[PDB]
JSON list of C-alpha atoms and ligand atoms in Angstrom, two decimals:
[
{"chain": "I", "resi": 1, "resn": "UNK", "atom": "CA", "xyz": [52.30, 115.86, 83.01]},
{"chain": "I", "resi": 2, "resn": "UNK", "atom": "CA", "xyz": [51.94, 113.33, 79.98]},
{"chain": "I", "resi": 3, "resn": "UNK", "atom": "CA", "xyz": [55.21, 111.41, 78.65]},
{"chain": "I", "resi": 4, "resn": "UNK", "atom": "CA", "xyz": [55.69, 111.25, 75.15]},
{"chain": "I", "resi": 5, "resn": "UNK", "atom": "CA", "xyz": [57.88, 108.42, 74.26]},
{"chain": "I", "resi": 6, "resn": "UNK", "atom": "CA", "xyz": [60.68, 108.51, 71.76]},
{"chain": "I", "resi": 7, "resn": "UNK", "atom": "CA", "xyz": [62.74, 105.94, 70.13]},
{"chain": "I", "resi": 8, "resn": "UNK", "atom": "CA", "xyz": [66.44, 107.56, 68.97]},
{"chain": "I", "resi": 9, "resn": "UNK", "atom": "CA", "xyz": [67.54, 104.47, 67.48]},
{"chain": "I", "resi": 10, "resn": "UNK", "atom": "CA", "xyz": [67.78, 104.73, 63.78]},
{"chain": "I", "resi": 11, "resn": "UNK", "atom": "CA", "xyz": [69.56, 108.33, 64.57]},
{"chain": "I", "resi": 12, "resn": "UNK", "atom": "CA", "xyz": [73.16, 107.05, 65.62]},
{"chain": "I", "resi": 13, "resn": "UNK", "atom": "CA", "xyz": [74.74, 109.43, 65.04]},
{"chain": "I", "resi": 14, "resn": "UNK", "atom": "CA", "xyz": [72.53, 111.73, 66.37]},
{"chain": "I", "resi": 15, "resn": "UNK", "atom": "CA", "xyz": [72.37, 110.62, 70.31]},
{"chain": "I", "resi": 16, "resn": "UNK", "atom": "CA", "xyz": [73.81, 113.33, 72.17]},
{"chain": "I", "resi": 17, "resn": "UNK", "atom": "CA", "xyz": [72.14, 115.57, 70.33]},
{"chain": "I", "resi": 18, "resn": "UNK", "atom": "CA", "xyz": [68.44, 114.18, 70.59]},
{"chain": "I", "resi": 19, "resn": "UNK", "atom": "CA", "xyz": [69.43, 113.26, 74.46]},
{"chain": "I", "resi": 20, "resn": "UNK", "atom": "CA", "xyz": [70.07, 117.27, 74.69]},
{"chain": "I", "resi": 21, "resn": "UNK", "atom": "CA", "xyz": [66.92, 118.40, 72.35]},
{"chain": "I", "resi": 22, "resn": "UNK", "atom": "CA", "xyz": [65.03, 115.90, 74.79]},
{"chain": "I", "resi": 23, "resn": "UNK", "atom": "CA", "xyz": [66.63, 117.56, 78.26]},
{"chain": "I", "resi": 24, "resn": "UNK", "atom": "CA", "xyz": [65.96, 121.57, 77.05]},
{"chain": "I", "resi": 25, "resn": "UNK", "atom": "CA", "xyz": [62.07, 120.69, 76.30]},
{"chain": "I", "resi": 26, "resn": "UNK", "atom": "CA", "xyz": [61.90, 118.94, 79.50]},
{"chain": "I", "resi": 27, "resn": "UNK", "atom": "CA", "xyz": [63.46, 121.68, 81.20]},
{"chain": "I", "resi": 28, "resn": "UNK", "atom": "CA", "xyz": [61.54, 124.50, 79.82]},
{"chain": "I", "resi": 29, "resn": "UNK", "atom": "CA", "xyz": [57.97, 122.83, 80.22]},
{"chain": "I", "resi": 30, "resn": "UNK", "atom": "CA", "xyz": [55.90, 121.51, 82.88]},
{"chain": "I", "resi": 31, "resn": "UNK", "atom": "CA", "xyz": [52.88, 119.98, 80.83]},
{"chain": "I", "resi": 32, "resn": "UNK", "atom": "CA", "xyz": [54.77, 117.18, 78.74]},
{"chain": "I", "resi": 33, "resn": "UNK", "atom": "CA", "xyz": [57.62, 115.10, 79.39]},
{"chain": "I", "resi": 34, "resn": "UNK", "atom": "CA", "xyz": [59.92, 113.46, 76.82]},
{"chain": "I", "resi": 35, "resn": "UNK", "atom": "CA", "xyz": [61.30, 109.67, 77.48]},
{"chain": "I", "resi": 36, "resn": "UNK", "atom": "CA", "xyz": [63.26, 107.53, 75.50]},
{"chain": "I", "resi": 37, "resn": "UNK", "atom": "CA", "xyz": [61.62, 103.79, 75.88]},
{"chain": "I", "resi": 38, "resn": "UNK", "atom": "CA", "xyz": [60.31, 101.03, 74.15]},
{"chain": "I", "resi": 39, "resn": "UNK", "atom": "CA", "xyz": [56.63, 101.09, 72.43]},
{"chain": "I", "resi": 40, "resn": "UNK", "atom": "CA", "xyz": [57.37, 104.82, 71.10]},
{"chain": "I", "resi": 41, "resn": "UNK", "atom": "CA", "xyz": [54.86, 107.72, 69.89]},
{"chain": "I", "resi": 42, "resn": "UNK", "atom": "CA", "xyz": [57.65, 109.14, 67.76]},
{"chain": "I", "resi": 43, "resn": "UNK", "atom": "CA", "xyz": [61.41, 108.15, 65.88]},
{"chain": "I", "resi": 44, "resn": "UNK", "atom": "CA", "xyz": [64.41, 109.69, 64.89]},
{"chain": "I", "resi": 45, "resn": "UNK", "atom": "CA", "xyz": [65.95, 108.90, 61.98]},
{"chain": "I", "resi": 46, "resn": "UNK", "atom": "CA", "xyz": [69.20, 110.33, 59.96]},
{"chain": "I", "resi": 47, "resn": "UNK", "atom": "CA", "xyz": [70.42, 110.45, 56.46]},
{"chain": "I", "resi": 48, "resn": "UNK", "atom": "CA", "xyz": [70.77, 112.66, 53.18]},
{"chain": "I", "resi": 49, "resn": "UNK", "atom": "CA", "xyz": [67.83, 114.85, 52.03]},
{"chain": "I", "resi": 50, "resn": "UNK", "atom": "CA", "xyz": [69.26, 118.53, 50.78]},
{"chain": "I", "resi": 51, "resn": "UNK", "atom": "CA", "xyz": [65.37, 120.38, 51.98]},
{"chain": "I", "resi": 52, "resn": "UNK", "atom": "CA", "xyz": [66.90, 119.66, 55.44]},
{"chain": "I", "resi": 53, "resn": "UNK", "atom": "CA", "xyz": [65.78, 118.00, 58.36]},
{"chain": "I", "resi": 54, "resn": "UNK", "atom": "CA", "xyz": [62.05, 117.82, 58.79]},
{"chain": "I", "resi": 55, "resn": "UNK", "atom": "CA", "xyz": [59.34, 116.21, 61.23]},
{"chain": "I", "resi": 56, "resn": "UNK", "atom": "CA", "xyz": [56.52, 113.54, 60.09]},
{"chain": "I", "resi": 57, "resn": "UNK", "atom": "CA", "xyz": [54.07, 113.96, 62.52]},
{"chain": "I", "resi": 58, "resn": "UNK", "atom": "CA", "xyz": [50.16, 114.39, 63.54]},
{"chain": "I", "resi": 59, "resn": "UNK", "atom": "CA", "xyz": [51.59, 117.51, 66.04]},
{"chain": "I", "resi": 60, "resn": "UNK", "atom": "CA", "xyz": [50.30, 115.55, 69.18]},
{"chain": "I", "resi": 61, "resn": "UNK", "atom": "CA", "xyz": [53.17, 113.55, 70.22]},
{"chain": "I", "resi": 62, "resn": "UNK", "atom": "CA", "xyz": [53.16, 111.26, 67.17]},
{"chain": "I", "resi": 63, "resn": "UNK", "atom": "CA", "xyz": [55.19, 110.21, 63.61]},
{"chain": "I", "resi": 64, "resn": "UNK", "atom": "CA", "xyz": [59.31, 110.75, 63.07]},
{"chain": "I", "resi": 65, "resn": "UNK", "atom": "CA", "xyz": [61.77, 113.36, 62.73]},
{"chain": "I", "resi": 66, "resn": "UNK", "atom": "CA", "xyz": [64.57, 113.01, 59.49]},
{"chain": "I", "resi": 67, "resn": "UNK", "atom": "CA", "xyz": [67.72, 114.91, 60.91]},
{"chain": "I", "resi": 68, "resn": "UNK", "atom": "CA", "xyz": [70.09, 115.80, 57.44]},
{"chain": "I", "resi": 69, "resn": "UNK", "atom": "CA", "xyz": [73.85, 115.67, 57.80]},
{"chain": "I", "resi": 70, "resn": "UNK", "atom": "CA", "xyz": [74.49, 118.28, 56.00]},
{"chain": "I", "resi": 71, "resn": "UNK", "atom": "CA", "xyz": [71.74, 120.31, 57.77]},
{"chain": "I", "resi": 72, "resn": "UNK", "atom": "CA", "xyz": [72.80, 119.35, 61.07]},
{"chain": "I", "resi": 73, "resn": "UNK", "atom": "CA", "xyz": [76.56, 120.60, 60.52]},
{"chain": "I", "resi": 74, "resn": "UNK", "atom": "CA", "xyz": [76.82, 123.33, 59.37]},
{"chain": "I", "resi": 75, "resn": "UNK", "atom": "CA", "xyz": [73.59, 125.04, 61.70]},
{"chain": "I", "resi": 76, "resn": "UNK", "atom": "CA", "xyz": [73.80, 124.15, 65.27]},
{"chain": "I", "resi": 77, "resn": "UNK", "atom": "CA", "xyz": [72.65, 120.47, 65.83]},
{"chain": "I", "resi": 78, "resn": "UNK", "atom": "CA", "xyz": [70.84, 120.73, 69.21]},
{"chain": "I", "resi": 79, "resn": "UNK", "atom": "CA", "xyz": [68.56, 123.79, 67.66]},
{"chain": "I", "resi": 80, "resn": "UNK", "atom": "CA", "xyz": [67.82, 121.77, 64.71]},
{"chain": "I", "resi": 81, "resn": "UNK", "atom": "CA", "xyz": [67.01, 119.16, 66.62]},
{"chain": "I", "resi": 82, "resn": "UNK", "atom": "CA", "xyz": [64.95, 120.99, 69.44]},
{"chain": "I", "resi": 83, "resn": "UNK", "atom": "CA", "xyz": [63.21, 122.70, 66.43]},
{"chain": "I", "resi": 84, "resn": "UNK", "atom": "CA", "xyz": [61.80, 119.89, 64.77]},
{"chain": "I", "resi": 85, "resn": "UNK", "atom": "CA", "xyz": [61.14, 117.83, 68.20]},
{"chain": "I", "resi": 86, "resn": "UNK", "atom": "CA", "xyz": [58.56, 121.40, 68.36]},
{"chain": "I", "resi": 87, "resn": "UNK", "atom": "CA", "xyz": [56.73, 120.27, 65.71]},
{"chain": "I", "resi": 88, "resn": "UNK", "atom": "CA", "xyz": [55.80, 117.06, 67.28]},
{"chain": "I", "resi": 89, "resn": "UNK", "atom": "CA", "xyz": [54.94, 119.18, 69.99]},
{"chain": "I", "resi": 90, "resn": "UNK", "atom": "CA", "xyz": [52.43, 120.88, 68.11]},
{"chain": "I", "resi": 91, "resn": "UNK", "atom": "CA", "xyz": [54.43, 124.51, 67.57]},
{"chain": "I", "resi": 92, "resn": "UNK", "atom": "CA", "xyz": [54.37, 125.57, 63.89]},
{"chain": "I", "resi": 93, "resn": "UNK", "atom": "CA", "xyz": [56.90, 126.97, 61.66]},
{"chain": "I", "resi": 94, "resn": "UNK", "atom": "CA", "xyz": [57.69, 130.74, 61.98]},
{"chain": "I", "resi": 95, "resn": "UNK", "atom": "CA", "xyz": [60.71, 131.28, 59.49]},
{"chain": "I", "resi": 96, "resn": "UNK", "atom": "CA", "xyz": [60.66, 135.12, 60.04]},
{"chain": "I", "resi": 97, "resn": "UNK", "atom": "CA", "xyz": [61.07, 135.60, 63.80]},
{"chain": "I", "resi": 98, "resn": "UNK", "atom": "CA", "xyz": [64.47, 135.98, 65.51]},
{"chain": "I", "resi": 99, "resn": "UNK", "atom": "CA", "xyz": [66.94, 133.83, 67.07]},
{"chain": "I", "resi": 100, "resn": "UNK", "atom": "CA", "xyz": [65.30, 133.66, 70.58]},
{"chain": "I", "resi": 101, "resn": "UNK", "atom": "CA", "xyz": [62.41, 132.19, 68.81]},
{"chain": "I", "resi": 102, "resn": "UNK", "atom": "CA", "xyz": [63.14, 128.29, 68.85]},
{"chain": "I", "resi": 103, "resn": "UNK", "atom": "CA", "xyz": [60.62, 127.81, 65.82]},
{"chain": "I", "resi": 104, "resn": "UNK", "atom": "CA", "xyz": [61.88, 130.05, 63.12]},
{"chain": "I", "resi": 105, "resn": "UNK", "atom": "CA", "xyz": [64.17, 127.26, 62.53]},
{"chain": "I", "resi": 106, "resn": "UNK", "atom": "CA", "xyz": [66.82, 128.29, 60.02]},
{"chain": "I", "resi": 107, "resn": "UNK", "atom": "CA", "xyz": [65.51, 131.80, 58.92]},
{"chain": "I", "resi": 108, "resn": "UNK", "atom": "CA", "xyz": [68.32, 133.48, 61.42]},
{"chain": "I", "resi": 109, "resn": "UNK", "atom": "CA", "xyz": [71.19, 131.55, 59.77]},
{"chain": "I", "resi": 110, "resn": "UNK", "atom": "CA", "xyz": [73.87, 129.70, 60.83]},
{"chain": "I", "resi": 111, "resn": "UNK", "atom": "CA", "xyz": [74.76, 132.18, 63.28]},
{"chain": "I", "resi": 112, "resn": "UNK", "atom": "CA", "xyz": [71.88, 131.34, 65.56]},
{"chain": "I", "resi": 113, "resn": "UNK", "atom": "CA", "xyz": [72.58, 128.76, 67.87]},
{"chain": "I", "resi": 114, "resn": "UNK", "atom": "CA", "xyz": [70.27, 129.00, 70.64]},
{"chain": "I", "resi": 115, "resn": "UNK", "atom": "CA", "xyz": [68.19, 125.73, 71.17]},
{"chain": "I", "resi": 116, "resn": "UNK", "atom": "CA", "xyz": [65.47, 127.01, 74.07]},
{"chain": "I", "resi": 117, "resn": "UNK", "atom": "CA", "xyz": [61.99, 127.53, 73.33]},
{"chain": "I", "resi": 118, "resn": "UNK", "atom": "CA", "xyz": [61.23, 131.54, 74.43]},
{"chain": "I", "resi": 119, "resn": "UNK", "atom": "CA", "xyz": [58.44, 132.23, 77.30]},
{"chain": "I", "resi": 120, "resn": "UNK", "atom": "CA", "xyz": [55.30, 132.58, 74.18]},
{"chain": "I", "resi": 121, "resn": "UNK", "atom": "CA", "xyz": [57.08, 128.91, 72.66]},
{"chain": "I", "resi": 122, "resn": "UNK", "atom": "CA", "xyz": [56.33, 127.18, 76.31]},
{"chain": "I", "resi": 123, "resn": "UNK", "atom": "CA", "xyz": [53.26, 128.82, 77.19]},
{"chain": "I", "resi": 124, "resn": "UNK", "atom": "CA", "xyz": [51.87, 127.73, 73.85]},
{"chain": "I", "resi": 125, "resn": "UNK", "atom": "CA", "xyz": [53.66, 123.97, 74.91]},
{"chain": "I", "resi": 126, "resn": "UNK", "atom": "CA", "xyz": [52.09, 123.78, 77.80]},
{"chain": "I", "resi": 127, "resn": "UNK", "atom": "CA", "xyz": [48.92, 125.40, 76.43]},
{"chain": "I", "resi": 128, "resn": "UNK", "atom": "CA", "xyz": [48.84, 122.19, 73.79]},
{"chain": "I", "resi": 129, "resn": "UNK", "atom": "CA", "xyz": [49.13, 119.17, 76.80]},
{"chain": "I", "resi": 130, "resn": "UNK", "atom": "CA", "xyz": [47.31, 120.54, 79.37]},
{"chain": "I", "resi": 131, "resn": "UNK", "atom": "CA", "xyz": [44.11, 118.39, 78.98]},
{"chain": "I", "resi": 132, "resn": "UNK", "atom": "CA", "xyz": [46.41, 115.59, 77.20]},
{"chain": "Q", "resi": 201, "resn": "CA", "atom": "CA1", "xyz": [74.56, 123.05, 70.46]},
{"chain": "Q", "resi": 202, "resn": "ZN", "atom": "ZN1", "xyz": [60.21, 123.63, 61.31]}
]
Protein backbone atom coordinates (compact mmCIF):
# COMPACT_ATOMS: atom_id res chain seq x y z
CA UNK A 1 0.00 0.00 0.00
CA UNK A 2 1.39 3.56 -1.05
CA UNK A 3 -0.23 6.85 0.61
CA UNK A 4 -0.99 9.55 -1.53
CA UNK A 5 -1.15 12.71 0.36
CA UNK A 6 -3.75 15.38 -0.06
CA UNK A 7 -4.08 18.85 1.12
CA UNK A 8 -8.12 19.95 1.34
CA UNK A 9 -7.35 23.31 2.39
CA UNK A 10 -8.19 25.80 -0.24
CA UNK A 11 -11.65 23.63 -0.60
CA UNK A 12 -13.59 24.97 2.58
CA UNK A 13 -16.33 24.45 1.77
CA UNK A 14 -15.78 21.30 0.45
CA UNK A 15 -14.46 19.20 3.71
CA UNK A 16 -16.96 16.72 4.37
CA UNK A 17 -17.23 16.01 1.11
CA UNK A 18 -13.44 15.39 0.15
CA UNK A 19 -13.15 13.62 3.83
CA UNK A 20 -16.02 11.18 2.30
CA UNK A 21 -14.51 10.99 -1.49
CA UNK A 22 -11.20 10.18 0.54
CA UNK A 23 -12.99 7.30 2.95
CA UNK A 24 -15.01 5.39 -0.25
CA UNK A 25 -11.51 5.09 -2.28
CA UNK A 26 -9.90 3.91 0.77
CA UNK A 27 -12.55 1.56 1.38
CA UNK A 28 -12.89 0.07 -1.98
CA UNK A 29 -9.02 -0.42 -2.64
CA UNK A 30 -6.24 -2.17 -1.13
CA UNK A 31 -3.21 -0.86 -3.31
CA UNK A 32 -3.31 3.02 -2.44
CA UNK A 33 -4.24 4.87 0.48
CA UNK A 34 -5.42 8.50 0.64
CA UNK A 35 -4.17 10.89 3.71
CA UNK A 36 -4.71 14.30 4.36
CA UNK A 37 -1.12 15.80 5.69
CA UNK A 38 1.33 18.27 5.21
CA UNK A 39 3.96 18.13 2.13
CA UNK A 40 0.98 16.98 -0.31
CA UNK A 41 1.06 15.12 -3.89
CA UNK A 42 -2.27 16.70 -4.71
CA UNK A 43 -4.91 19.95 -3.65
CA UNK A 44 -8.34 20.74 -3.63
CA UNK A 45 -9.47 23.80 -4.52
CA UNK A 46 -13.17 25.46 -5.04
CA UNK A 47 -14.69 28.25 -6.95
CA UNK A 48 -16.72 29.28 -10.21
CA UNK A 49 -15.86 27.67 -13.59
CA UNK A 50 -19.36 26.75 -15.60
CA UNK A 51 -17.22 23.38 -17.63
CA UNK A 52 -17.54 21.96 -14.06
CA UNK A 53 -15.26 20.57 -11.73
CA UNK A 54 -12.15 19.07 -13.20
CA UNK A 55 -8.71 17.42 -12.02
CA UNK A 56 -5.04 18.89 -12.89
CA UNK A 57 -3.03 16.07 -12.61
CA UNK A 58 -0.05 13.71 -14.06
CA UNK A 59 -2.71 10.52 -13.16
CA UNK A 60 -0.10 9.11 -10.60
CA UNK A 61 -1.03 10.64 -7.43
CA UNK A 62 -0.07 14.20 -8.44
CA UNK A 63 -1.53 18.05 -9.40
CA UNK A 64 -5.18 19.54 -8.00
CA UNK A 65 -8.73 19.02 -8.32
CA UNK A 66 -11.18 22.48 -9.03
CA UNK A 67 -14.61 21.41 -7.40
CA UNK A 68 -17.48 24.11 -9.11
CA UNK A 69 -20.33 25.26 -6.92
CA UNK A 70 -22.64 25.11 -9.18
CA UNK A 71 -21.44 21.65 -10.32
CA UNK A 72 -21.26 20.32 -6.99
CA UNK A 73 -25.05 21.25 -6.12
CA UNK A 74 -27.04 20.43 -8.18
CA UNK A 75 -25.19 16.60 -9.01
CA UNK A 76 -24.34 14.75 -5.94
CA UNK A 77 -21.16 16.25 -4.27
CA UNK A 78 -19.43 13.10 -2.92
CA UNK A 79 -19.66 11.46 -6.69
CA UNK A 80 -18.27 14.52 -8.12
CA UNK A 81 -15.82 14.53 -5.87
CA UNK A 82 -14.90 10.70 -5.83
CA UNK A 83 -14.95 11.11 -9.68
CA UNK A 84 -12.38 13.52 -10.15
CA UNK A 85 -10.17 12.19 -7.02
CA UNK A 86 -10.23 8.94 -9.99
CA UNK A 87 -8.47 10.84 -12.21
CA UNK A 88 -5.61 11.42 -9.95
CA UNK A 89 -5.82 7.91 -9.53
CA UNK A 90 -5.11 7.27 -12.97
CA UNK A 91 -8.93 6.08 -14.18
CA UNK A 92 -10.01 7.95 -17.34
CA UNK A 93 -13.14 9.53 -18.35
CA UNK A 94 -15.98 7.23 -19.62
CA UNK A 95 -19.03 9.69 -20.14
CA UNK A 96 -21.20 6.89 -21.71
CA UNK A 97 -21.31 4.11 -19.09
CA UNK A 98 -24.00 3.88 -16.38
CA UNK A 99 -24.45 5.02 -12.96
CA UNK A 100 -22.58 2.10 -11.22
CA UNK A 101 -19.66 3.23 -13.17
CA UNK A 102 -17.90 5.91 -10.82
CA UNK A 103 -16.03 7.42 -13.98
CA UNK A 104 -18.73 8.35 -16.38
CA UNK A 105 -18.95 11.31 -14.24
CA UNK A 106 -22.00 13.34 -15.21
CA UNK A 107 -23.21 11.45 -18.40
CA UNK A 108 -26.10 9.66 -16.08
CA UNK A 109 -27.44 13.03 -14.84
CA UNK A 110 -28.31 14.39 -11.82
CA UNK A 111 -30.16 11.45 -10.90
CA UNK A 112 -27.08 9.37 -10.31
CA UNK A 113 -25.78 9.62 -7.03
CA UNK A 114 -23.72 6.73 -6.36
CA UNK A 115 -20.05 7.68 -5.38
CA UNK A 116 -18.28 3.89 -5.33
CA UNK A 117 -15.94 2.85 -7.85
CA UNK A 118 -17.57 -0.68 -9.47
CA UNK A 119 -15.39 -4.10 -9.19
CA UNK A 120 -13.54 -3.25 -13.13
CA UNK A 121 -12.97 0.73 -11.47
CA UNK A 122 -10.84 -1.00 -8.41
CA UNK A 123 -9.28 -3.72 -10.14
CA UNK A 124 -7.98 -1.21 -12.64
CA UNK A 125 -7.00 1.04 -9.11
CA UNK A 126 -5.26 -1.41 -7.76
CA UNK A 127 -3.91 -2.58 -11.13
CA UNK A 128 -2.28 1.23 -11.41
CA UNK A 129 -0.30 1.13 -7.62
CA UNK A 130 0.66 -2.16 -7.42
CA UNK A 131 4.43 -1.67 -8.21
CA UNK A 132 4.04 2.13 -6.91
CA1 LIG B 1 -23.59 12.09 -1.34
ZN1 LIG C 1 -13.82 13.03 -15.26
Amino acid sequence: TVTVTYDPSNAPSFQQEIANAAQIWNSSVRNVQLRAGGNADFSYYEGNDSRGSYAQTDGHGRGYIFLDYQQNQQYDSTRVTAHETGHVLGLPDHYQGPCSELMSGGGPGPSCTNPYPNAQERSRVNALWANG
